[PDB]
Design a protein around this ligand. Structure first.
Ligand SMILES: COc1cccc(NC(=O)[C@H]2CC[C@@H](n3cnc4c(N)nc(-c5ccncc5)nc43)CC2)c1
Ligand SMILES: [Mg+2]
Length: 348
């Protein structure tokens, strides 16, 4: 399109070497993810054109479509620190990032011992770093209260969605949030820099590193990241073991309660997290380690309720406003079913 030109100009003007002197009739762009927001494209030199210096042959273009300062600063910082794709270009419409040869993980891979251990280690790393953002943990209850406010105001026109929403509203979401509030306020959890969306779709498996045991993954997509309770980040990740967003028919996901990590799988994950986060931890006694882990299991199982609640509310608002083809109302109902299931399991 016209879009094609613009993208050519971005690459020509922002990228070094071969790119600088490149013609419009040599530009290779393809869609990776279309839509109206956060569109993703692959852009590349002709296979035929040689590279002057260090310039990449392929880049990823992200377009904002339809807090900008914050996300940009964070992405740049993560690039500088080698915990994210390099930033090659930034502009009002979007950015040019490094193209990492890789694929996203699938849902079932989250439970593989070595994958899970590395995710825990990466999360521990992310959690231990300093970022120029507000350190007060207002994000969790702030976001829930914001989405709850939207939810309570939403009017659907179509009858199907009116009834689905009516069933969700019948839980008494305001009162249930206060129930969650008293539970979580009685559960100490350290405030750390949280990814807040640590799912398979945000975890790259690096090409050529598949044989590495401990270093084959990169966490990406920090758009929800904030200082938050560590319980949320781990609990949210555990919840993600149940949800597979690759299903190709309506509602475009599958939920499987049975796939929530067992006590053993949770212990495996936190056994890998804790030494990467707490430098002393390795040197503690067996009983002290055991005490910490048992406490941490209670912590993250309770914060998993907020994952269900927050993303359930979020998903209701998305049904009203999103352009993505996804069964948002059914996903909201699946999160709320898991919320009540997890409360029954915990006895809270
Ligand atoms: C609707 O189809 C989709 C939706 C999202 C992502 C994808 N495809 C991929 O993620 C593939 C594996 C990773 C590939 N990749 C190489 N470098 C990448 C980069 N820097 N970012 C992302 C990326 C960014 C935000 N969300 C998902 C992936 N992806 C990068 C792109 C192709 C396909
Ligand atoms: Mg994402």
């Amino acid at each position: 399109p016209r879009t094609r030109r613009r993208a050519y100009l971005w690459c020509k003007e922002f990228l070094p070497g071969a790119w600088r002197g490149l013609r419009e009739d040599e530009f290779h762009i393809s869609v990776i993810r279309g839509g109206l927001s956060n569109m993703l494209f692959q852009c590349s030199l002709p296979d035929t054109t040689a590279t002057l210096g260090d310039e990449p042959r392929k880049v990823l273009l992200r377009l904002y479509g339809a807090a900008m300062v914050l996300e940009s600063v964070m992405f740049a910082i993560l690039a500088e620190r080698s915990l994210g794709p390099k930033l090659y270009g930034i502009f009002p419409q979007g950015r040019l990032e490094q193209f990492i040869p890789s694929r996203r993980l699938d849902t079932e891979e989250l439970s593989l011992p070595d994958i899970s251990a590395e995710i825990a280690e990466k999360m521990a790393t992310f959690h231990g770093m300093k970022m120029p953002f507000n350190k007060e943990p207002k994000w969790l209850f702030g976001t829930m209260e914001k989405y709850l406010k939207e939810v309570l105001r939403i009017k659907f026109t179509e009858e199907s969605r009116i009834k689905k929403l009516h069933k969700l509203l019948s839980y008494n979401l305001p009162l249930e949030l206060e129930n969650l509030r008293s539970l979580l306020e009685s559960t100490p959890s350290p405030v750390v820099f949280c990814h807040n969306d640590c799912q398979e779709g945000n975890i790259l498996l690096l090409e050529g590193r598949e044989n590495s045991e401990k270093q084959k993954l990169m966490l990406i997509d920090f758009e929800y990241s904030s200082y938050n309770y560590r319980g949320f980040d781990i609990g949210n990740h555990f919840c993600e073991w149940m949800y597979d967003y690759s299903y190709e028919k309506y509602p475009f996901f599958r939920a499987n309660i049975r796939k929530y990590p067992t006590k053993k799988q949770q212990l495996h994950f936190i056994s890998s997290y804790l030494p990467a986060f707490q430098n002393d931890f390795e040197n503690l006694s067996t009983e002290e380690k055991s005490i910490i882990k048992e406490e941490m299991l209670l912590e993250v199982n309770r914060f998993a309720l907020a994952s269900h609640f927050l993303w359930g509310l979020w998903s209701i608002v998305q049904a009203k406003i999103s352009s993505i083809e996804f069964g948002y109302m059914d996903y909201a109902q699946a999160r709320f079913d898991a919320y009540f299931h997890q409360k029954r399991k915990l006895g809270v």
